[PDB]
């Protein structure tokens, strides 16, 4: 009754296929084959309400066939991952966002940015730069460490919250439009009837 | 589908039992027994629309039982008759109107005044007085001659017109009230929903 679908997009060697497994099975693997592309399902309890999460990790070889994007775009949330040592991954994330914008053709979609593997490795890309990019793009930024299991839950919860906010806004706007049309028609009917009553009373 | 009921009230020797018969059967009688009390039915075509008229002439002996007034008050139109030679009939008409006021308990009822037998007999009561009483009472006044068959049709048509006007006014007022209540409730709902939408938008 309450299911949300999320897609995780990143680059090569930036923590791909290492966050979903840690979130689901609570276990870590040092090496995994990137050729594996699989979907995961898990139930959660967020804000006192149970929910279902489907997670799809973008993997596999380079593909551009129309059937791939036809089977895709079913996602409702998008999480883009990056590390603090790949300007190449920065540019890849920018290009991926630019492409999904036009592919979905929706003005705004639930989008979150995640920085992985920060505590252990050396740190190069400035937090000021990361926050500036996040503020310029208009999407939340979250720092997550895969091996220590911190940040994933809050990032997923915030993405779900964004989805809920968008749905509520759409519903409220539609209802307001309907009520406004109601009011206009009733106003015209009342004006006509009152004018007729006045004209009839004037005769007698 | 369109039936109206009228009651004709007068006094002694003021043309009673002589207008209804002339209207219905198109014939005149010089003498009629006042003890006869009967009801008449007739179809008419007024303003291009067919209608049914039931006519009840107030006759018989003086009766004050509650059963009489229970069988009565079913009338929707009232026609009060008078001549130009009986101040007694004038006072009787005034008293009858005063009594039907409280008997019906309605603020206003379809009421017409008719002056009978005017061309032939000597003329005493002033037309200025008659018109002054009619204007003071707020009811139309019509001059009718029984033997020459003039005025009855127009008097009945005007009474029917008053009935139609009253019905139309009541319907229009009821419809306006219902529409206004609709308007109020819908406006409050719209205000609440718009406030909620603004509050939700302010967060994001």
């Amino acid at each position: 009754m309450t299911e949300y679908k999320l897609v995780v997009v990143g680059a090569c060697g930036v923590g791909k296929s290492a966050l979903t497994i840690q979130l689901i099975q609570n276990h870590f693997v040092d090496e995994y084959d990137p050729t594996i592309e699989d979907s995961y399902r898990k139930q959660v309890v967020i804000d006192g309400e149970t929910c279902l999460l489907d997670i799809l990790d973008t993997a596999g070889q380079e593909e551009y066939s129309a059937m791939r994007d036809q089977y895709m775009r079913t996602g409702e949330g998008f999480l883009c991952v990056f590390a603090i040592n790949n300007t190449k991954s920065f540019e890849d994330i920018h290009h991926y966002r630019e492409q999904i914008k036009r592919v979905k053709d929706s003005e705004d979609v639930p989008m979150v940015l995640v920085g992985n593997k920060c505590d252990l490795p050396s740190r190069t890309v400035d937090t000021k730069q990361a926050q500036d990019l996040a503020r310029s793009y208009g999407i939340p930024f979250i720092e997550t460490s895969a091996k220590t299991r911190q940040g994933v839950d809050d990032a997923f919860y915030t993405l779900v919250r964004e989805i809920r906010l968008h749905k509520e806004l759409k519903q409220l706007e539609e209802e307001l439009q309907a009520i406004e049309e109601q009011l206009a028609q009733l106003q015209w009917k009342a004006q006509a009837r009152k004018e007729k009553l006045a004209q009839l009373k004037e005769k007698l | 589908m369109t039936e109206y009921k009228l009651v004709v009230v007068g006094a002694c020797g003021v043309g009673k039992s002589a207008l209804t018969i002339q209207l219905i059967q198109n014939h005149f009688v010089d003498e009629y027994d006042p003890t006869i009390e009967d009801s008449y039915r007739k179809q008419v075509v007024i303003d291009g629309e067919t209608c049914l008229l039931d006519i009840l002439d107030t006759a018989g002996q003086e009766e004050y039982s509650a059963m009489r007034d229970q069988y009565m008050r079913t009338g929707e139109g009232f026609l009060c008759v008078f001549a130009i030679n009986n101040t007694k009939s004038f006072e009787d008409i005034h008293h009858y109107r005063e009594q039907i006021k409280r008997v019906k308990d309605s603020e206003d009822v379809p009421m017409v005044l008719v002056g009978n037998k005017c061309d032939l007999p000597s003329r005493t009561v002033d037309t200025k007085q008659a018109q002054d009483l009619a204007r003071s009472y707020g009811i139309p006044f019509i001059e009718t001659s029984a033997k020459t068959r003039q005025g009855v049709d127009d008097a009945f048509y005007t009474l029917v017109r008053e009935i139609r006007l009253h019905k139309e006014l009541k319907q229009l007022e009821e419809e306006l009230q219902a529409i206004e209540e609709q308007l109020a409730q819908l406006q409050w709902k719209a205000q609440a929903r718009k406030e909620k939408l603004a509050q939700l938008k302010e967060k994001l």
Partner: nanobody
Amino acid sequence: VQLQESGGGLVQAGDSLRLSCAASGRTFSTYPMGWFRQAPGKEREFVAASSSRAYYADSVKGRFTISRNNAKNTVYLQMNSLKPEDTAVYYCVADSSPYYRRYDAAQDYDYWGQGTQVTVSS
């Protein structure tokens, strides 16, 4: 309570026609009016309506004209640049309920007329 129609017939393609629907029952100045159409073997489709603002169908937009005169309670439909695919039967409709009724709903109106035939040759 009664509506009368005039102007139907058979004409050629590309000409212009003008049809009239008059309400002769009683006062209809507080009653919205409109037009519906039906082809042989098809379903009812709303064409135009008179309300607070003019409402039009998607398939005939930009060509038809609807006029209302409250002096005699008449509604006129003027059609120009006519296409041959409009040969059908047209009905005049009116509304009387005080509560809200959908304008594009065929089942929300309560007063109907006899209807007229419009035919266009090749």
